[PDB]
Structure formats: structure tokens, C-alpha cells
């Protein structure tokens, strides 16, 4: 971990994921959201297998491009009560 | 004229506390952040999106 | 040879695992008991030799894979296990009597000689620690871990340190399969063990050394229903320090997680009744009520096995339709609303009594009340409702079926 | 025999519920949990020893973002949701207000209300807040309570009062004090011409 920076690991294992940086959110602990920044994609392929391999039997993965689901339900029930606001 | 403007008044104010308690469902972790929220509020949203603005 | 036996394992393994991930009750049986005759062909196969070094290693593991599977099948232990291990230990010192603990030991002095199996050996520990841990010999265990670990560690007395110490040796090399490995077993005793040391500290009565351990159990491999049994404890050991506020958070937690919300509501329905709130006590038993309407496995050791079935005392236990019932209805004529509680009398015995066709509500606890004061209960209750006729005939009934419970019954016969 | 009759009721046997009536009473479950909490005890519980000056800690600024951080801070420390928090804030600050002293209020009480309700339009932008949860602690209060605040609160979206009524349990107690409050209304609304304009909108309304 970095002490100036808690949220980010960075690895020290001294094959191919080198220099690889992660983070992890952990939130309703069922829940939680994995940040990879690899040095190529390759990389980022051989982190997930490796990880798949080592979680529990039913975990679904999913990648997010654009957020949380979580937060863009809310931005979405927002900008519904918005315009129903303005309807109103 | 004025019939017209209160039935669409209505037909929007029951989406409006449709959606206000989803919105309270989620502040509560009532429904729990899955995904029936997400098909709700994309159903509210193509309610509305069929003939939206008339513009006179 | 070996190369055959190898591959019939790795074979059974996969016909394991297929039948674990698919199929549906029927088929996964059959499949997996066919996979566990395989196996204990071979292990009588392998048996038959005697046991040459470079064998060892899959022997031990053909045997652990045995053990879990017929395990996971029965849903339980037993003691040919046990017995499977002291052969395969005997097995090990034939290469190089007494009883578990000296076997154990000259075992152990027989490995930190390095022959390289201890990524099966320290399985087996685990599945023996796990027998262990199922039939309470908690004094054998820790001694056994304490021999594990340097004797250094000789002081601490204490068991869940003492598991987390302990660290089985290897990465597992590229070694013949197996349904199940040393650290997702070390990963469900830590949670076992903490879990099961939770609830007797909550019993014995000292809730401040439980929160510690019962947050140690979530913290882990922790099931959802080991997790909705971790909240309810800790709803339990807030109830018995005073502190309803925190209780009430534990439960609503357990309510929302859970699929198995019966102990939930118990333990609201003593908060309240230590509290007072008589109302939300019976409307949280109403509930409970309700609730006992509503009602899969794998071939791997899983951690509802070395939980035990819980005591009377505990928190978890739940009765049937039929005890809750009555304590529902016995509940409400002490707060003094009679009406109700008859009503409920009523379906109770009737839930007793009028069931013949269908499948039996049991009578009450062997602690909870004996019949005859049922009947009587249920006979107050409907005096104090203001219903003496239908008293008359339950108490003439009762005598008609079969002391002091006599008098008794001449006596609310006469308040009739 | 006769005497089995009458001690034979026929709703014994029973089927499963469906698994939807199952999440109802599960649903119910926590909200009966909840009906039964309280924030003060749980400030007197985990926290040793309820105002915004708690959570604002005495009196530093009046900023909406200040005070949305302390609320949340203070729902990291119980492990408490941040809405709820934050209606049964509101609804004590409401209750200040409206016990400070008859339906018809005043003004300076409506400058201090109409700053509070800023700001919980604030809150409600930024999904900080329980609609049911805040409406069941004001009929918690229901005496404090004046007929102008919760027209105000419909008024200002807060609440409406078609959400009040419905979420009120004895619905014979709601009528009562509806005839009650009304009542006084109309006693009130020719002691001014001033204050009959906002007692005339708040019951045409």
C-alpha cells in the first residue's frame, strides 16, 4: 500500500504484473469495484484469470466503462425528478 | 384548453411519486441496488419518451 | 502403473466436480457415488501395495479425497475416517500403534525429515482437525497444532490464534487433483471455530469477549447463512449488555441479508420483552408466526459441517409452528389481550388435535409444557377471553381423554 | 364430541406463502425494527455522552456543504444511512420551531423554517434523504406540529400532504385533528386580512 495514498496496492511480484497498479473499493461487502492500470492489455488478462481463479464459486464479474450502476440509478431517478419537477 | 393539460398534470404526478420512492427505496437500500430499479426507471423513461413535447 | 492411478483420480476428481457444478439431485448422486466407489476401488488398490516411497503422496490424496467426499455425501462425519487416517499414518511409518496423538507426532518427526508431501499431509491434518472440531476435543487440538506449529507456541493456550499460526507449506505444486485444498480449509475453520466459540461465550454468559471473536467470524469465509447467524448473535450479545439501539441495527442487518429470518425475529421479540414495548414484542412474534411458514449441498467441506446443531439456550434455536404458536398465544393472555390469545389457543390445539391426514406439528418442547397444561393454558385463556362454554367443553374433553391438573380442572371448570 | 366441534377451527392446515408475500413480511419485518428506533439513544449508545449543533459542532458556519459533510460523517460513525440521519434532524429542528411559541404561526418562525427548508431541498438533491422515514418522525410529534409547517412542506415539495396522511397509523386520529386544526382555521381566518390570505390558499389547497 502507499502510505500517502491508501486507496492504491502496487505490485511487487517480480514476474509479468509488475508495475501493475490496482485499487480497491470495497462497499456493501457483497459488493466492491476493482480498478486495474497495467503497463499493456495482456497483462490486464492474465490479472482477471488469475483472479478468477482464487474468488468464490459464483462471482459475477462485470467491467464498467461509465460508472457504478449503483450511482448512474441515481443520476437516472434524478434527472427523472427533475423533468417530472419541471413538469409539475 | 385546460382538460388536456390536467390529464397529462396527472399522468405525470403519479410517474413523479412512482419514482420519488424508488428514490426513497434507494437511499434506504430497500430494493438493494441490483437491477429492477434500473428496468423500472428505464420503463418510466420510455413512458415519457413516446410522445414527448408537443410544441405549441 | 502409477500414471494409470494418477489418471483414474484425476479422472474422478473431474466426474466430481462435473456432477457438482451441474445436475440435478438424482443425477449428482449417482454420478458422485460412482466417483466414490472409484475411489475406494483405488484406495484398496493402492492398499494392496507396500506403500514404497515415491507411492505416498497419492495415496494421501486419493484418502483425503475420499474422506471429503463421503462426508459431503452423508452430511456428516463419522470414525472410519479416522481410522482411514491412522492407516495412512501407519502407511507413513511402515516406509519409516500407540494411538492418535503419538501417531501424530512420529508422523510429524517423520516429515520434518522432508520428504516432500506436505502439501497433502497438512490437508489431512485439516480433515483430521476438522473430525476433531466436529467431536470437541478442542484439548487434543490445540495440542496437536501446538506439535504443528514450533512447540515455541506452547503457551498459547488459546485455539483461533493457534489456527491462524498455522500455514500450510506449499503453493501445491503440480500434484495429482483434489476436491478441496489446505487453505480453503484453514479459511473454514477459522470461521467454524470462531463461530462455534461465539455462541458458547454468548451462553456462559460473558457478551464482551464475544463481540471480538463473532466480528472475527464475518470477517472470513463467512456464508450467508453463517452471516445472518453472526448478526443475530451479535443481536443477542447487545440485548444482554443493554443496548437495544445497537441490537435493533444488528437485526434489521440480518433481516435484509438473510433468507432464514426466524432467530431475527426471536431475538426482537426478547429485546422488546426486557425493554417492555409489550405491542412490538407481539406484533415481532405475529411475525415470527408468518415466518415459519416460508421454509443445495457440495462435494467439498463446506462449513454447516462443523457447526453443531444448537442448544436450547442459544439464540438460534426456533421451535415449530406449533411451540411458537403457543408461545404466541400463551405470550398474549400474560399481557392481557385473551381474545387473541384464545383465538390462537384454539388453532394450536386444533394444529395438534384435528391433525391426523396431514403431516404432524409435534407437541411442544421436553422442557417446554407437558399436554395437560396446555389444555389448561388454553382453558384459561378462554375464561379470561369470556368464553367459559367453550372451556366447559375443553376442560370436559381433556378429563374424557385421560391429579393436581384435575383439580386444577375442577377449579377453572368452576370460574367456567 | 360436541365439546370437539366447537374446539375445531378449520384454517389450521396452511399452504407455503408465496415467496413475494415472503420479502411483504420481511419488508414489514425491518420496518417494525425501525418504527422502533431512536437516534438519541443511539447518540447516547455507541457515542458517549439531538440538534444540527451536535453534527455542525458548535455554532462554526451555516453552509449547505458543511453541513451535508458533518451528516455524513456522523452516518460513518454509527454505521447509520445518511437519510435517515438526516429526517430525523429535520424533524427535531421542526419540532423546535413549531413548539416555540394558535394554528397560524409567525414570521421570524417562518424566516428560521424557510432557511431549514433550503436546506433540506438541498439534501433531497442530493439523495440524502427519506421522504417515509422524515414523515413518520413528524406523527411521532403530532402536537408540536402546526397546520401552516406542513403546508409549507407541500408547498415546498419536502412532503405533500396526500404522503402525510397516508403515512400516518391510527387514520381516526389523522380525521380528529384534521376537523381540529380546520376548525381553528376558520376561527382564525377573519382575525386579518393579512393572515386570511394564507389561511384562505392553505385550505383551498
Redesign the interface.
Known amino acids: 500500500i502507499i502510505k500517502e495514498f491508501p486507496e492504491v496496492y502496487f505490485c511487487e511480484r517480480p514476474g509479468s504484473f509488475y508495475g501493475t497498479l490496482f485499487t480497491w473499493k470495497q462497499r ?1 461487502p457483497f ?1 466492491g469495484i476493482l480498478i486495474i492500470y497495467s503497463r499493456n492489455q495482456t497483462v490486464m488478462f492474465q490479472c482477471l484469470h488469475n483472479l478468477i481463479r482464487i474468488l468464490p464459486i459464483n462471482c459475477f464479474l462485470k467491467n464498467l466503462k461509465s460508472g457504478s ?2 450511482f448512474l ?2 443520476n ?2 434524478f434527472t ?2 427533475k ?3 419541471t ?2 | 384548453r385546460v382538460q388536456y393539460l390536467r390529464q ?2 396527472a399522468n ?2 403519479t ?3 412512482e ?6 427505496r ?5 430494493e ?2 441490483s ?1 429492477a ?2 428496468q423500472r ?2 420503463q ?2 420510455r413512458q ?1 419518451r413516446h410522445p414527448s413535447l408537443i410544441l405549441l | 502403473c502409477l500414471d494409470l492411478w494418477r489418471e483414474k483420480n484425476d479422472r474422478l476428481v473431474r466426474q466430481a466436480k462435473v456432477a457438482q457444478n451441474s445436475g440435478l439431485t438424482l443425477r449428482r448422486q449417482q454420478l458422485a457415488q460412482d466417483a466414490l466407489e472409484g475411489l475406494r476401488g483405488l484406495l484398496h488398490s493402492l492398499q494392496g501395495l507396500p506403500a514404497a516411497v515415491p507411492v505416498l503422496p497419492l495415496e494421501l490424496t486419493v484418502t483425503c479425497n475420499f474422506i471429503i467426499l463421503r462426508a459431503s455425501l452423508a452430511q456428516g462425519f463419522t470414525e472410519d475416517q479416522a481410522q482411514d487416517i491412522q492407516r495412512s499414518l501407519e502407511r507413513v511409518l511402515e516406509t519409516q500403534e500407540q494411538g492418535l496423538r503419538e501417531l501424530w507426532d512420529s508422523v510429524l518427526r517423520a516429515s520434518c525429515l522432508l520428504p516432500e508431501l506436505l502439501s497433502a499431509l497438512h490437508r489431512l491434518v485439516g480433515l483430521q482437525a476438522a473430525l476433531w472440531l466436529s467431536a470437541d476435543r478442542l484439548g487434543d487440538l490445540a495440542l496437536l497444532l501446538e506439535t504443528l506449529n514450533g512447540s515455541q507456541s506452547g503457551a498459547s493456550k488459546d485455539l483461533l490464534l493457534l489456527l491462524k499460526t498455522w500455514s500450510p507449506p506449499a503453493e501445491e505444486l503440480d500434484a495429482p487433483l483434489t476436491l478441496q485444498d489446505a487453505q480453503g480449509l484453514k479459511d473454514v475453520l477459522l470461521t467454524a471455530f470462531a463461530y462455534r466459540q461465539g455462541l458458547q461465550e454468548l451462553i456462559t454468559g460473558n457478551p464482551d469477549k464475544a463481540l471480538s471473536s463473532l466480528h472475527e467470524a464475518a470477517s472470513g469465509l463467512c456464508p450467508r447463512p453463517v452471516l445472518v447467524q453472526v448478526y443475530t448473535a451479535l443481536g443477542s450479545c447487545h440485548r444482554k449488555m443493554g443496548n437495544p439501539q445497537r441490537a435493533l441495527l444488528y437485526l434489521v442487518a440480518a433481516l ?1 441479508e438473510g433468507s432464514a429470518w426466524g432467530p431475527p425475529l426471536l431475538e426482537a421479540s426478547r429485546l422488546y420483552q426486557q425493554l417492555g414495548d409489550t405491542t412490538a414484542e407481539l406484533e415481532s412474534l405475529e411475525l415470527l408466526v408468518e415466518a415459519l411458514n416460508v421454509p443445495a449441498p457440495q462435494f467439498l467441506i463446506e462449513v454447516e459441517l462443523l457447526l453443531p446443531p444448537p442448544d436450547l439456550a442459544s439464540p438460534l434455536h426456533c421451535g415449530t409452528q406449533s411451540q411458537t404458536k403457543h408461545i404466541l398465544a400463551s405470550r398474549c393472555l400474560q399481557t392481557g389481550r385473551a381474545g387473541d390469545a384464545a383465538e390462537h389457543y384454539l388453532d394450536l390445539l386444533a394444529l395438534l388435535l384435528d391433525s391426523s391426514e396431514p403431516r404432524f406439528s409435534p407437541p411442544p418442547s421436553p422442557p417446554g409444557p407437558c399436554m395437560p397444561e396446555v389444555f389448561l393454558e388454553a382453558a384459561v385463556a378462554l375464561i379470561q377471553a369470556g368464553r367459559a362454554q367453550d372451556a366447559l367443553t375443553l376442560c370436559e374433553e381433556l378429563l374424557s381423554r385421560t391429579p393436581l391438573w384435575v383439580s386444577a380442572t375442577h377449579l377453572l371448570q368452576g370460574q367456567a | 364430541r360436541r365439546a370437539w366441534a366447537e374446539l375445531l377451527a378449520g384454517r389450521v392446515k396452511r399452504e407455503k406463502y408465496n415467496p413475494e408475500r415472503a420479502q411483504k413480511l420481511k ?1 414489514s419485518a425491518v420496518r417494525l425494527l425501525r418504527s422502533h428506533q431512536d437516534l438519541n439513544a443511539l447518540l447516547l449508545e455507541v457515542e458517549g455522552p439531538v440538534i444540527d449543533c451536535d453534527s455542525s459542532e458548535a455554532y462554526a458556519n451555516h453552509s449547505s456543504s458543511f453541513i451535508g459533510s458533518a451528516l455524513q460523517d456522523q452516518a460513518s460513525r454509527l454505521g447509520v ?4 440521519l438526516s429526517a430525523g434532524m429535520v424533524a427535531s429542528s421542526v419540532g423546535q420551531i413549531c413548539t416555540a411559541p394558535p394554528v397560524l404561526l409567525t414570521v421570524e418562525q417562518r424566516k428560521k423554517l424557510s432557511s431549514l427548508l433550503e436546506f433540506a431541498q438541498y439534501l433531497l438533491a442530493h ?7 422524515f414523515c413518520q418522525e413528524l406523527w411521532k410529534i403530532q402536537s408540536s406540529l402546526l397546520l401552516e409547517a406542513v403546508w409549507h412542506l407541500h408547498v415546498q415539495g419536502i412532503v ?1 400532504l ?2 402525510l396522511l397516508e403515512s400516518h397509523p391510527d387514520m381516526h386520529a389523522v380525521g380528529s385533528w384534521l376537523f381540529r386544526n380546520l376548525c381553528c382555521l376558520c376561527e382564525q381566518m377573519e382575525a386579518s386580512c393579512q393572515h386570511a390570505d394564507v389561511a384562505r390558499a392553505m385550505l383551498s389547497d
Open positions: 456493501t459488493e450502476e449503483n440509478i441515481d437516472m431517478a427523472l425528478e423533468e417530472l419537477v413538469l409539475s | 397529462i398534470h405525470h404526478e410517474l413523479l411519486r419514482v420519488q420512492t424508488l428514490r426513497d434507494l437511499c434506504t437500500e430497500d438493494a441496488s437491477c430499479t434500473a426507471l428505464l418510466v423513461y415519457l | 435484509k | 419488508e444511512p445518511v437519510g435517515i439523495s440524502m434523504f427519506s421522504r417515509l422515514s405533500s396526500q404522503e
